[PDB]
């Protein structure tokens, strides 16, 4: 008994998010967008979510990565 996925779709992606001069990386997700909004989802199934401080970790300042975008991060 096996598991096979299907019905794929196109999206755009970025390696990291720079907010307030710091680089934010995903925990176990991928950063995706469909337009004017950005979300985080798991690899093997589409499930968007809002970016908070409980699914990202911070390292350094957004000056060393090749490819980084500006966006806001919710603060609970």
């Amino acid at each position: 008994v096996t598991y096979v996925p299907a019905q794929e779709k196109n999206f755009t992606t970025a390696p990291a998010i720079c907010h307030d001069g710091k680089a934010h990386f995903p925990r176990e997700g991928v950063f995706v967008s469909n337009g004017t909004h950005w979300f985080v989802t798991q690899r093997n199934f589409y499930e968007p979510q809002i970016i908070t401080t409980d699914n990202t970790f911070v390292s350094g300042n957004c000056d060393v990565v090749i490819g980084i975008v500006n966006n806001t991060v919710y603060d609970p």
Binding site: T2, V4, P5, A6, E8, T13, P15, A16, A23, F25, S59, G60, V64, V65, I66
Partner: protein, 100 residues
């Protein structure tokens, strides 16, 4: 199968692994940038992914240098393909002994 057919198969496998990763071995193939694939493979041994994103050039240079050194190491040392040569020699010796 002729030689060019096997070469075509090897090229197909190389292209598939370069452009997709491990996704094409189970179901349809999906596309992803190469540095992200490298970061994901880093996460499989116990290293956080940011380590890759701050040392890209160093890793790329080391990779290229290793490939060049592999070419030179293969070229220089003469006795590196012993197994296949041994197989050919054994078959030829058996046939010659049979004919004699």
């Amino acid at each position: 199968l002729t030689d060019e057919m096997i070469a075509q198969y090897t090229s197909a496998l190389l292209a598939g692994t370069i452009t997709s990763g491990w996704t094409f071995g189970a179901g349809p193939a999906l596309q992803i940038p190469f540095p992200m694939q490298m970061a994901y493979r880093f996460n499989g041994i116990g290293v956080t992914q940011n380590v890759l994103y701050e040392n890209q050039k160093l890793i790329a240079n080391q990779f290229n240098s290793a490939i060049g050194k592999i070419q030179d190491s293969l070229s220089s040392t003469p006795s590196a393909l012993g197994k296949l040569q041994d197989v050919v020699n054994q078959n030829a010796q058996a046939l010659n002994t049979l004919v004699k």
